[PDB]
A paper describes a structure:
NA, which is a sialidase, catalyzes hydrolysis of terminally linked sialic acid and functions as the receptor-destroying element of [name] and B viruses. Additionally, [name] NA is further classified into two groups: group 1 (N1, N4, N5 and N8) and group 2 (N2, N3, N6, N7 and N9), based upon primary sequence. Group 1 NAs contain a 150-cavity (formed by amino acids 147–151 of the 150-loop) in their active site, whereas group 2 NAs lack this cavity. NA inhibition assays were carried out and complex crystal structures were solved for laninamivir, laninamivir octanoate, zanamivir and oseltamivir in order to elucidate the structural basis of their inhibition.
N5 on the other hand contains Val149 with no 147–150 salt bridge and displays a 150-cavity like all other structure-known NAs with Val149 and no 147–150 salt bridge. To determine the structural basis of the inhibition of laninamivir relative to zanamivir, we solved the very first complex structures of laninamivir with p57N2, p09N1 and N5 at resolutions of 1.8 Å, 1.8 Å and 1.6 Å, respectively; and the complex structures of zanamivir with p57N2, p09N1 and N5 at 1.9 Å, 1.9 Å and 1.6 Å, respectively. The typical group 1 N5 contains a 150-cavity in its uncomplexed structure and inhibition of N5 by laninamivir and zanamivir was better than inhibition of p09N1 and p57N2, which contain no 150-cavity in their uncomplexed structures. Unlike p09N1 and p57N2, N5 contains Tyr347, which forms an additional hydrogen bond with the carboxylate of each inhibitor. The additional hydrogen bond between Tyr347 and the inhibitor carboxylate is also a key factor in explaining the higher N5 inhibition relative to p09N1 and p57N2. However, like the closed 150-loop, this residue also makes the active site cavity smaller and in this way may also limit access of inhibitors to the N5 active site. In the open state of the 150-loop, when the 150-cavity is formed, Asp151 shifts over 1.5 Å (the Asp151 Cγ is shifted over 2 Å in N5) away from the ligand binding site, which should facilitate entry of inhibitors like zanamivir and laninamivir. The typical group 1 N5 contains a 150-cavity in its uncomplexed structure and inhibition of N5 by both laninamivir and zanamivir was the highest. Therefore, we provide structural and functional evidence that the open 150-loop of a typical group 1 NA may facilitate the entry of the 4-guanidino group of zanamivir and laninamivir into the NA active site, relative to the closed 150-loop of group 2 NAs. Laninamivir was in a similar range with zanamivir for N5, p09N1 and p57N2 with IC50 values of 0.90 nM, 1.83 nM and 3.12 nM, respectively.
Author numbering:
A (entry chain A), B (entry chain A), C (entry chain A), D (entry chain A): 82 to 164, 164A, 165 to 306, 308 to 347, 347A, 347B, 348 to 385, 387 to 413, ...
């Protein structure tokens, strides 16, 4: 086993093809499937896996009550092979966690899981299934991380964490690790900005992240850093807002540097992603400007470098009559593709239950996964598909 | 790992011995088993696997309602070891799919799964579990494929697809791939003919296919092609019709070149198979001429080359009091047999529920699998065996 | 991988220690566990597995109705790791089968499974999971085999089959195979004798079998053969009868050559085992002389060579207040023990339901497994432990 | 594969970070999870596993009735990957057992399981899944062992067993084994002392054990021995009692040599652990002095060598409003950590049901696991989390 380089350029893609759909909630109507949320995908040299935060309880069981709640001692990071339901018998335990990130360095799996009290949480770093290091909360205010794949290059793995208020200035840090040990860290200066739940991917030896601003921005923060943790921080330049909530495109003016908000969009957001394509960008967003429903991906001409409103391509993978949720980025390594570039992929979380579906006592999600290809691909609507309410709700 | 040659001659066999029976629906009365249809078997260097199209739902669950329906965003191609039920905890996710084919090239599994809207579907090609390529619908009319094993020879894998009307002239294409990338394609000129759901196998370096004509033929199309995708197309010469519906043998006159139909047999069919045996042929068919019930296999003397009605051997593996369905061909590679020829095998789908059993809200199937041997083997009736209706039907 | 020699002498043992108990029926009260019977154990170079004949149905499900029945198209030979319940998600499919034997030659698993009609059954031989050969019924009267491990030595695997009446003179054959192909066979001349369900093991390069006489003998047939299939046949000499039904010891006089019966013991029996120990023998038997209840193993001084009634050791592993059933022999290869002799082990089937427990609609069994050790070991009573009737019975 | 040295010094640690939580009882409300107790963790070269004693029955099933009972023929030692629920489909069978220990020598798993009658029990030693040796009861009074990981160094594995009265002078023995064969044993002279359920770990080539005195001591016995089975025996010197029941710290005076008890603490106890840290000690204990509730770990300055009451650090991992139970020690080998010292870890059993929760008919437990790290780590309360009573209790 050797470390994955992962220093190749990101592939330029013209479309996204569906790779998997787990149908976990449909299956969990009768099968034994964890209540989850915050799923994500990460790939190693030979396989991709779906990670997720369980609620330490199964669908259609009484312990699924009140699972809209974000943090508890019962939540765990676990994984299954890509496409499998997050079920009770295939799930691989990764970490105790109510917030997490994971990735593969070419030799072993790295998993970072945060648990503990809101005012004194800590991340446990697991490497090859063994606990190796810890990161303590430095602001004592809900230490939290990506809820998507971290990035490994040349044997070093990188991720972003936040600590501090949800709706005002917080603290943002980049971490570097080798074989599960933290070897470097850097605080990101971002006055007036807010960074959470970064979706990051490798691109020509740098880590590029598209994040969530839960404060004053309906545009998404962009964070780019190198192996030294030297960084650039700002916002996705595009004159098309991609957070939720947001306003209609025509009411929005882009900015490369400033959080753009107001108009009832402040103080919330949703995890999302984008992929740089030279000077352009593929960016995902919910179809609804106000709720987590529908999902589409847009190719915005020069959207990485200027306040462009030029949409070159748009593909819908979930119509606005169906519930979405988080989305995130990952890449497929050269060892699986034999290519000279890294294939950009994204996953989509489809949340069922509370708060949108009040007649259910629970909250869970299922996923779809899509990967970039060199040609245009039609969209469709691959919805969660579960019929609610469930037995336990009656 | 090396590519499988698969250029050996097909074995001549005198009988078919039962290899497996999954009893999936019986088990699914209580166990957690997917609702499926369109099962098939494919073999790699070291194991054979049963593939199937799920309905993204389990037996005896409410989500099994209306599963007679052919296409949805919830259907997936998955696999289990040969003989296992298609259950929720062993199933390996292969592709999103409401139509599919899969095979092993000696190094990795190839899976081709079609999803999307009827008027803009696309196949995603998965190789070693990674998405590698896409094939878009070229006629925008339910792009569809074999529902059985594709064929790999010398590192290249081949399959047949159709796009166009179900009951009139459509378009038929052969595809060639290497490591999951389409490297060649050829449209098959077949005016007045109709090709669907080809059952294909290697024979002395060529691919031989026996298909379904859903238009004017109660006889089965034969398609034979080489590595260049140069092809011969026509019908199984035998003066014994093997599609369903069909007429009694004595009311049928064979043709090597023309669809032979009429007499209330037009506009439907069922997936089936045949194996060339020199100039003769082993061909499967339902026992009923009008419904998918019973199953028998016939050795027809010179049936590959002339309109022979001479039945040399006949073996029944399912009596006409029990439901059948699709059947398909595969081969066992030399790496498992140590032989100098490729062993012909077939599987049989046994459909339960709608439309024949109206008191059930669902449709699924189970399977039996048989392989050719050098001696005569007695038949029997290995029926699905489930007792309907199920709990969910009441 | 190399073929196992298995030509070492059988170990002399002074006691039997419990190795596993699967508790399958207890577990199956709620878990998803096959209805089975005729379990047995066989060992490969690196693991031992429990094989069993399913009824193609799960415990506590309606399809378990009438599972007292011996033969159906739904029965399959499957296996799990030693000690596991025969459950729906770990079970490995081996063969379609209502009668079977299996063993490992050092390179691959051999499984022989008989299915088909009573008057035209056939065994399918599976090697490394691939069908390799067939054995047809030669008397057309319920072709049947050991229901325990076959024996492999130097790359050749051997087993015994019977065809003919259950309660009068039948036909008995020994088979030799290499890589799943039958390479030799020999009919055993045994006029007035009856052989079924042989429990066989290797001992100094010969195969020694202890069988069931279902005709005129309450003593057990002994069959010993070499690689040429040259054989000796007779009865266990001991003046202690070990079949069930039988009479009390004091009413029995042994014979090395003749079936000894009468006194209401004719026309039935139970699968059992014995291990030669020089001139002595370890022999198992039910505690009850009339029913399949309790289980004990006896060391009979010189019991292999003369009509001895001298019981040197007796160990009970199941008291007579609990149901037993079949028992059978296997050995542990040198590759697992590092010893110079083959360790004798036995398994015990504990049948629940019909016919002894009439208030249940089903019949299944669970198992315990014991291996010989160089010292005396106390007995106990490790009963099935399930509480009947089950939910499905009400 | 080579034998693990395991002769390194134990790491000095300043805190304990949570590594896993299985949530087994929560999951078992709907999933198929064994009723268990006496869980423990042991690590091999490449993975850690959770071992447990099942009751041969599943949660929420009628066979869970009366599982407060300690010993039966249905109990088995099984294992799952660290963090998994002890479920019906992942559980690996290890030994028949109502008392057990297990560990990995670098090449294979060793498992020691005791079953049989109270007055004639015996341990079966399993090595690489094969039975290798037996240890008989020498006092004929509930032969019993650690209920936690044994210790392997340089290819030899060591464990402690007890035989004799629960509440008066018993007999205590140390065992040494190589490849599953007992190669040495030594009786420990400890007049007036009582040793049960030792928690042992390697430290600089010696085995250090912290045990339970079920007779006259509310302080814990310490047993230290070398490869010759030469030993030192006494009590944890600290002037802080760590058994349960016990008295408040201020009412206790330590002793290195004598059982300190009385004040209603005699004749009971609970399995616990401690780790030497030079002259100091990390010791676990329930928060309650009288019941198995809460759990905390204390660093006591010089507590290994003198009657110190100086508590340097205290971390609570379970508050006193929640049920605890047994706790035990294990280490992570250098092959997983790349360190020069052995990482000390502990697990915590959280018992639900009888006797504390009388409205449940059953008793089971779940676990949390923590490993030592080089920095201080905050505590929290990671409770079992199941909501009782369960369905089966109503
Ligand atoms: C507190 O809410 C944060 C998180 O947001 C939400 C949500 O669906 O929007 C899900 C998470 N749930 C979990 N990851 N478990 C959160 N993050 C946490 C740590 O609660 C937010 O980003 C503001 O800080
Ligand atoms: C539309 O019907 C087609 C297919 O036929 C049927 C059937 O049981 O006969 C099952 C399929 N179900 C699936 N493979 N899911 C079909 N094929 C599709 C793509 O629907 C037919 O061959 C005509 O074009
Ligand atoms: C027909 O009865 C035979 C078998 O005996 C019985 C029984 O519990 O005694 C179980 C078997 N069940 C299965 N192996 N399935 C039988 N053997 C068969 C082939 O039915 C007997 O040995 C006489 O020929
Ligand atoms: C008899 O009680 C002993 C054991 O203690 C208890 C308990 O929760 O305290 C659990 C065990 N349960 C099991 N390991 N199954 C016991 N040990 C046994 C062998 O019963 C005790 O240590 C006195 O000898
Ligand atoms: C969920 O919690 C609410 C509030 O306690 C309760 O009223 C309801 O009955 C619970 N549902 C279940 C299934 O326990
Ligand atoms: C992607 O496109 C950009 C803009 O044309 C170009 O600079 C870059 O080389 C491309 N990357 C790859 C991997 O083709
Ligand atoms: C199946 O669908 C039909 C039509 O909506 C409905 O009447 C019936 O109740 C459904 N059955 C179940 C179990 O949901
Ligand atoms: C099969 O039979 C045909 C016709 O006799 C013959 O040409 C061919 O060689 C045979 N194939 C094999 C593999 O034996
Ligand atoms: C079992 O079969 C008998 C006879 O047909 C029937 O009376 C009984 O109801 C069946 N039990 C179940 C659970 O189907
Ligand atoms: C078993 O005992 C017999 C009788 O003493 C003896 O001939 C034989 O050598 C022994 N076998 C072994 C393997 O010790
Ligand atoms: C548990 O055992 C008691 C005593 O026999 C009995 O009263 C109770 O009904 C049992 N509960 C169950 C679920 O069997
Ligand atoms: C642990 O600390 C003790 C006391 O200072 C010291 O003697 C020992 O060397 C330390 N062990 C390690 C592995 O650092
Ligand atoms: Ca926002
Ligand atoms: Ca037709
Ligand atoms: Ca008899
Ligand atoms: Ca005590």
């Amino acid at each position: 086993p050797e470390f994955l380089n992962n220093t190749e350029p990101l592939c330029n893609v013209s479309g996204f093809a569906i790779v998997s759909k787990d149908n976990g909630i449909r299956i969990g109507s009768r099968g034994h499937v964890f209540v989850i949320r915050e799923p994500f995908v990460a790939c190693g040299p030979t396989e991709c896996r779906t990670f997720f935060l369980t609620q330490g309880a199964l669908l259609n069981d009484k312990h699924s009550n009140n699972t809209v709640k974000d943090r508890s001692p019962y939540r765990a990071l676990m994984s299954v092979p890509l496409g499998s339901s997050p079920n009770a018998y295939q799930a691989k335990f990764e970490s105790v966690a109510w917030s997490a990130t994971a990735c593969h360095d070419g030799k072993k799996w790295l998993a970072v899981g945060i648990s503990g009290a809101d005012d004194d949480a800590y991340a446990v770093i697991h490497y090859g299934g063994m606990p190796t290091d810890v990161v303590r909360s430095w602001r004592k205010q809900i230490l939290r991380t990506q809820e998507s794949s971290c990035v490994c290059m040349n044997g070093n793995c990188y991720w972003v964490m936040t600590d501090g208020p949800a709706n005002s200035q917080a603290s943002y840090k980049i971490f570097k690790s080798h074989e599960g040990m933290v070897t470097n860290e850097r605080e990101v200066s971002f006055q007036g900005g807010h960074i959470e739940e970064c979706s990051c991917y490798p691109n020509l030896g740098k880590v590029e992240c598209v994040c969530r601003d839960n404060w004053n921005g309906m545009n998404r923060p962009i964070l780019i850093f190198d192996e030294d943790l030297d960084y650039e921080v700002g916002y996705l330049c595009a004159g098309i807002p991609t957070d939720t909530p947001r306003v209609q495109d025509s009411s929005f003016t882009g900015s490369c540097t400033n959080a753009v908000g107001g108009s009832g969009t402040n103080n919330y957001g949703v995890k999302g992603f984008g992929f740089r394509q030279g000077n352009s960008v593929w960016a995902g967003r919910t179809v609804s400007i106000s709720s987590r429903s529908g999902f589409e991906i847009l190719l915005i001409e020069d959207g990485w470098i200027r306040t462009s409103k030029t949409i070159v391509k748009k593909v819908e993978v979930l119509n606005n009559k169906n519930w979405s949720g988080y989305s995130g980025a990952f890449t497929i390594p050269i060892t699986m593709t034999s290519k000279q570039c890294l294939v950009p992929c994204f996953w989509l979380e489809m949340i069922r239950g509370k708060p949108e579906e009040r007649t259910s006592i629970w909250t869970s999600s299922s996923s779809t996964v899509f990967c970039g290809v060199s040609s245009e691909v039609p969209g469709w609507s691959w919805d969660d598909g579960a019929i609610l309410p469930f037995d336990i709700d009656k």
